Amino acid sequence: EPEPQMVLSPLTSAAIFLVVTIDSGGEDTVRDLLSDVASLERAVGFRAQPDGRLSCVTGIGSEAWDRLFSGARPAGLHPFRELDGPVHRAVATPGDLLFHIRASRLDLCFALATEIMGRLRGAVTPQDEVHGFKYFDERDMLGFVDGTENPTGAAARRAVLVGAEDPAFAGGSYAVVQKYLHDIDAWEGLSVEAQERVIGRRKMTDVELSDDVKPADSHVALTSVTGPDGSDLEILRDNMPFGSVGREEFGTYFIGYARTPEVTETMLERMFLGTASAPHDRILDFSTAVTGSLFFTPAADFLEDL
Amino acid sequence: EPEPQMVLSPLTSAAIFLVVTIDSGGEDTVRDLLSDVASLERAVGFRAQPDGRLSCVTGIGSEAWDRLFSGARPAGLHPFRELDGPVHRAVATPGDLLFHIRASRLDLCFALATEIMGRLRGAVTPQDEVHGFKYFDERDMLGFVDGTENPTGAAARRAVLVGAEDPAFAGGSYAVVQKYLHDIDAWEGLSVEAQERVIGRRKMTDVELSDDVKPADSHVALTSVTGPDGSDLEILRDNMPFGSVGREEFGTYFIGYARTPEVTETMLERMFLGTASAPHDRILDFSTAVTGSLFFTPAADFLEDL
Amino acid sequence: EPEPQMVLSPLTSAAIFLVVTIDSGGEDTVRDLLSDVASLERAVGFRAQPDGRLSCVTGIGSEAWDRLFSGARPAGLHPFRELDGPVHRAVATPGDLLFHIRASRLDLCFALATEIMGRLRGAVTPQDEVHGFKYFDERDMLGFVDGTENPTGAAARRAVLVGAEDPAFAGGSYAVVQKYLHDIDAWEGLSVEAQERVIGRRKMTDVELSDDVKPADSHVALTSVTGPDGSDLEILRDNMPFGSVGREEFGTYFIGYARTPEVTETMLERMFLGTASAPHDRILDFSTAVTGSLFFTPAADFLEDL
Amino acid sequence: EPEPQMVLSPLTSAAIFLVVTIDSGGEDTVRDLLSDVASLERAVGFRAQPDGRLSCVTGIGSEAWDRLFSGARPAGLHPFRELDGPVHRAVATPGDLLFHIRASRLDLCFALATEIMGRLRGAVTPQDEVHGFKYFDERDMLGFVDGTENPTGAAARRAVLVGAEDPAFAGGSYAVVQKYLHDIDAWEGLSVEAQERVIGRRKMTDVELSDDVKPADSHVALTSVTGPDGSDLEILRDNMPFGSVGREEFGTYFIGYARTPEVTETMLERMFLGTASAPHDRILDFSTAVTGSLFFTPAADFLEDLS
Amino acid sequence: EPEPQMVLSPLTSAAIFLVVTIDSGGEDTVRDLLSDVASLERAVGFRAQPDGRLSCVTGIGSEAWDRLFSGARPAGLHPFRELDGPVHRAVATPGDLLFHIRASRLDLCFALATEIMGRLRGAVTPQDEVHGFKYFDERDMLGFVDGTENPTGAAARRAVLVGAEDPAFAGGSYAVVQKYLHDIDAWEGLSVEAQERVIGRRKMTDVELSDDVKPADSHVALTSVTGPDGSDLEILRDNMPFGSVGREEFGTYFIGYARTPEVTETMLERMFLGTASAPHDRILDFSTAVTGSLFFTPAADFLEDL
Amino acid sequence: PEPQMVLSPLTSAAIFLVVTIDSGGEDTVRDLLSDVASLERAVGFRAQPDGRLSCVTGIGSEAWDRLFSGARPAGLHPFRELDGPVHRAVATPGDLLFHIRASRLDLCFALATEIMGRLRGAVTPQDEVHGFKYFDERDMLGFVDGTENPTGAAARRAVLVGAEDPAFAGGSYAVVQKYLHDIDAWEGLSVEAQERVIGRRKMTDVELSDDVKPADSHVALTSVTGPDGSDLEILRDNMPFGSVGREEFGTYFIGYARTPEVTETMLERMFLGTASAPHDRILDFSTAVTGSLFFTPAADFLEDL
Ligand code: HEM
Ligand code: HEM
Ligand code: HEM
Ligand code: HEM
């Protein structure tokens, strides 16, 4: 049984997202860190167990994988596909490595980030750094409960982890990241009932709208994908609010894990390109993607044996 | 009799520091907010009780006071005095309003900050915004325990709150803010023993160094001041670590409360200018001040009666 | 000097409200319990200290007072004044003794109520029993945050505690209770915005509506009362949700404490009978009062010295 | 691989038990809700994770099963059997649906119960609604620690979940419910030592009485049952205290889960009908059963795959 | 106003009792420590806040006082008075210094003890060291809730703190320590009903026996002292269970704080010598005192100003 | 089979109880062993939320022959005394081990009282240690202790006996050692020197890089690779203990392993050294005063007895 990384972690209150590119000649330094990352996570985390719940998930990009490793590639590993929709665009931005650091405390995240980046000084260039925070009762920046319909247990494992379809990379996963900025002024201009029609759920109670009320262009409608056998195709999401009040930045940092990127990409396509029934996802009228990257997060045992 | 602001608050793990200048013609919008700031604190904070622990302390600058309030000034209110030492400099930077927001969770701080800043939009320009976090066991970015010798109870009340010396402003207090950036590379180049001689306390156990071992240019020695009376002059500090791993910013946000700014100014002079036996505070060899402002934090009832 | 009961208690998540009438010839049994009530509280409470936060407030009705005691009475102690509005009616129902039992857990409330009723058995007839519970983020059954504008600290003390206006009963207070049942079906028929106009505050954020938007017949407008001297007249409220799903019973148990009943009664009159601007309180269109009683809660020392 | 309901729940300090009968012509509305119950649980409970620990276990009665479904029946599903002993009797009362709602706080229980009943209005009639609360030291209303000898971990899973003996309903369980009211006057009239002889355990320390001093008519003795092979027969119990002080109601709401009702029913028999060495369970001298119903609690996927 | 030591502390679950005598020529070392004890408390306690709840109360005996300090003595300071009763004896044992260390965790206590004894090494001889632990439900070694009738708030302050009757030592207190060893075998041979008659309270529910049911030789009866004033004479107690399973030692470490030792001494006389109504305290038939010492615990600033 | 609570969540308090069985006290002991699990529940259940009470019961090699008939655990033998050039690992008598853990010491004590109450007059106590962990998981030497313990499935394969000895599957081997520290000598060292002794940074608990990590550091000598090339792991639960009056500052070491071979190898490397290292530098500040090996059977084994 291959040990996965802490993809299927419990709910945490704080996150740091770290996206870097690998400078030329930096390959060796990166490789050294990769084999040490698990022990660094344990070194920082153990001090404050068991309420710390510190984890780090390391992701490697498509272009970077070719620079770092020879031999087999994960079947689904490719650069993020840019989506030029009629109205909305899903941009692809550079990213070689992803560090998805989560804890119940921000300091634990920052300490681990410090350690990781300290080792990576002069080998990487930082592309993006986001410090996320749980907002109230699991609500996002739009004021809706965010995470409700995430799969749990065996359903989560089946949706997230690579299996026998790519046996060399079993216990791995695929992560899609996008940084979204919200137009809060426009959003708070809508009535609650109008916002509900945008999301597809009720605001306070988080009850899903009935199928006869739920618009075809609501976020919930478009991100609902049925598979070839009638089964729901699921992803695991850990959206984190971030922001700066002075610069008027109110954002959602989207991260979605799946066993194949094709599930996540189908959702993206429906959202940005639209379908026959829906011009595009209404949430995009209040949200702008400013980054977009795809990573493969290998099994933990892959990282150690380098 | 006069009800003070929550200067003497319980220990909080998160904080937002918000410094703004008042734009020309923005005075009425500011005055309006100041009368509602307490009810915004309750509106955001109440639903998170009792462990939310949300509080906001509002401070007003010297120049800002004259623009806003026609009437008597607090006796100790003046612009931050710039200190130009032989080696180190304490800069004075713009700042009309200070919002010191604390809570057990960052989201509480962010929500209130949004509300305040939403009301002030178009009337203020942001000068500084810092998101602070408690780091492990009350440690600062230098890895030392921070806040040990803070006064408590009545001793704290007596050292912080304006009394009969300025009866029109009883229940008020004076806040000095400075944003410090650390040279962590140089700092981690010192042995622990050398670091302890810089601070004046043991690193791990936080036990004060013996009188005959403690250096004169150590932080503890230079920030220890006895008044003409013979008793210790004390301030209330709530230093918060902050920073960004990508941009390699590791900082301390200093805020000190005192019933008269004279106390805080004496400490600063001792630090930056030095004494007979000490050129300057050794902590300054590893810390650069980038901001510097002084604010009067009125009694709560002063703010409500506008 | 006179020690009050735990009227100004921290916020608790559980409550038991117990209203009984004294049976003929039951006066002696009642007096014995009253002298012992404080010690029963300690006996039950201490086991679960310090997070138990168990307290009991004992109130005595007007008619009950004249049966139990001789000599001087509290100045404002009268039976509940029935209000006959054109539309809405505030009923008065029998109640001699009030037991207001609060704790962070229901078991502590139940164990104390059991000890009290065990000692009173054969002397009292139960009129009303309500088991109350905190509902989410301090929300009531209407979905609004309840308790935001309660006075705190010294302001709460001045609003609640009898002082020099009635020196023989200093440290006492007056409690008004009303059991309200809500018409949830009608309530949920309104949009959120329409509900906000009924209450006078924003639903999710609990921000008070601007004065130029807040309707004259909103709950907040009608319960805001100023005295001749311009100061706000305040009560301490500790409403608790209750109900049963099978009976479609969704209620608010109202309890308001004030130094004089005149304050509570004024608010109650503006709600039920209306003003020049407003016919009645809109909240009553969705709330029916089914009980109504007034009690005096004496100083703790009055109860002991008996 | 079967996905069970949250029968094996962590320790929770609040519960709502809701027992309803299905009105004539209410089958379709009930069918729709059963399909949505897990999503209603998430809607209410997610916002209060992880400390909320909100779960709902849905049970279906024997008579109700035939009205709702057309396929196979669970092997051990039948109406609650009345036990008519010489002194004490275990009554059978009506119940088509059971909602066993648990959380760390009552508010989450009440919210979910509101959502469920909101959808079922005009299709069902409530028979029983009990709001349970944790009482101090995991004690019941008799003042004894309650739940000490519950199976845990793997032993619990084996005693509770249906397996290959009924493969189509694997992941399911059987729930027996009884509402007991206590005679607290008579009970507190006993000495502690005398109460300990009734239960079979020490009151304050909760240590089990030795085999030599433990009476044959004690609760622990009569509810201890060995199989033919000699292994202990176990049930999972999550009794909740409840009551009203003014009405003098001091109660234990009993709920027992087992992979087969035979186990639970054997215990009931020994309690009410007695043995050769014991007339009846001594606890019944201070406890009256006021309700009695049997339900099958299906695997969660059975409820989902109902459209 | 003088600052007292943390004699009135929110009760904790762990304690170390440390009693030492001062060796020849050890006065100087002791004086050095006493002036540092408060800062040692913060050094060990601060970074563990707010959960640690670490405090140290330092007591000084009658003989020790005259070796350490010149000038006035506390009015009530004298050696522990031996009580040679007809059946039971209250022994006196040597002790110059008392350290009463409390926290929520034993490790916090041990760390402070280590620091104190580290500084006192070679100047003192240890007489007693006790590691104390409360049961989860505030029960003592006898299985009874212990601490129920301790005074709280202002009543506690008035009973424990030295006031105007001895103005120079205001804010001080008197501590009496006794280590008791229990005969558990004998105690557990009693039925609960019999044990209740020994104590004077119900075992399970901690309800006090009624006045006419409570035996006169019960613990609660004999330790209930009414002064010529008419009001109750109270002490603050913090009994801590201790023991060794292997050595069959099951003990209660008694410590009682009062503004004058006469209060404690009167109760102690009643327990050991009895009254006209009762031969002795019934608890003593199951409890043997093996140590006895009296200490003055001065105000914090008294120690600081050395 | 059902294992004992060897794989426990982290607890801040512990009592270690080591006793020998007096002559003729075998039957009394057997009776306890069958009830010990139910005593654990009895004391623990009422505090079930946060109690985290558990008891691990171990039996020594000599005691096993006295108590049982027939099959012995393959790896069960008396603790090997190691007499090194400088440092000595002593063997001390021990028949039964009670490893009791909880979030609070009162719970440990309550259980310990029940067990010893029934064992009274049948056993002699050899050792009784009341353990407390520092709030930041630090040991008596001021270093974070437990960082590199295996978790999850890795911990199961390292600790629990499996198919290699099927009759005793679910069992484990515990080695206990009571260490007393020379604190004065320890606090004489600089932080940097202390780090060279341990093999990890003191504050941040980051392992020293392989270029700087000394060969005689604790982490170096206790890092063992088997023939497979895989790392040989044990589960440790070191507890600080002591007395400020007696100047006792100690670590009570306990190590669980699938086979005692792994623990004994680490122990050899520490006391006897390698080619690169004379001995473990931690021993220059730590003296072993007890040493005993026990087999901790599956819970079922004790029940059906
Ligand atoms: C613009 C930023 C976004 C926000 C604020 C957002 C917020 C939400 C909210 C409030 C829900 C409903 C509650 C829940 O189940 O979590 C939801 C559902 C969901 N979102 Fe998003 N979302 C965002 C972007 C995305 C993206 C980019 C994807 C994938 C490409 C995605 C996939 C989903 C899925 C699969 C669901 C569950 C739908 C279902 O009920 O089956 N979201 N999101
Ligand atoms: C460069 C950023 C600074 C850092 C990292 C820092 C850190 C510390 C530390 C570690 C201590 C010892 C522990 C404690 O008692 O809190 C301390 C003490 C103190 N600091 Fe600072 N400090 C800084 C700047 C300042 C400034 C600007 C002032 C006032 C002008 C100040 C005033 C004090 C005082 C009064 C004490 C207590 C000294 C005593 O009486 O023992 N510090 N600081
Ligand atoms: C009248 C209400 C009842 C009360 C107050 C009650 C209370 C208790 C108590 C205090 C215990 C001992 C502690 C424990 O292990 O939980 C216990 C044990 C038990 N009860 Fe009950 N009980 C009741 C009814 C029932 C019923 C109706 C059944 C089954 C049909 C049952 C089955 C059991 C079982 C199986 C045990 C464990 C016995 C053992 O193996 O040690 N109880 N009960
Ligand atoms: C042998 C060790 C002792 C034990 C186990 C013990 C235990 C108890 C218990 C269970 C109570 C009742 C609950 C409470 O209010 O705390 C109590 C009350 C009390 N004890 Fe003790 N006690 C001991 C020694 C002492 C001594 C030596 C004194 C006096 C010097 C003392 C003074 C008191 C007082 C004043 C009360 C409160 C009486 C009242 O209800 O007003 N105790 N003790």
Author numbering:
A (entry chain A), B (entry chain C), C (entry chain D), E (entry chain B): 7 to 312
D (entry chain F): 7 to 313
F (entry chain E): 8 to 312
The authors write:
A widely applicable approach is the use of photocaged substrates, where the photocage is soaked into the crystal in advance and then activated using a laser pulse to provide uniform initiation of the reaction throughout the crystal. This work characterizes photocage release of nitric oxide and binding of this ligand to two heme protein systems, cytochrome c′-β and dye-decolourizing peroxidase B using a fixed target sample delivery system. In this work, we describe a thorough characterization of the application of the NO photocage N,N′-bis-(carb­oxy­methyl)-N,N′-di­nitroso-1,4-phenyl­enedi­amine (henceforth referred to as NO cage) to room-temperature microcrystals of two proteins: a gas binding cytochrome c′ (McCP-β) and a dye-decolourizing peroxidase B (DtpB). Laser parameters for photoactivation are systematically explored, and time-resolved structures over timescales ranging from 100 µs to 1.4 s using synchrotron and XFEL beamlines are described. We have demonstrated a sample and time efficient approach using fixed targets to carry out time-resolved SSX and SFX experiments with an NO photocage over the microsecond to second time regimes.
On binding to the heme, NO was observed to bind in an end-on fashion via the nitro­gen atom with an Fe—N distance of approximately 2.0–2.5 Å and an Fe—N—O angle of approximately 105–150°. The variability in these values occurs across the six independent heme groups within the crystallographic model and could represent either genuine differences in binding due to subtle differences in the crystalline environments or simply uncertainty in modelling a small ligand into the electron density features. A small shift in the side-chain position of Asn245 was observed compared with the ‘empty’ site structure in all six of the hemes, and at all laser powers and timepoints. Assessment of occupancies in light-activated processes remains challenging, particularly for small ligands such as the diatomic NO. For DtpB, the structure of the NO ferric heme complex of this or any other B-type DyP have not been previously determined, and thus we have demonstrated here that such a complex rapidly forms on exposure to NO after photocage release.
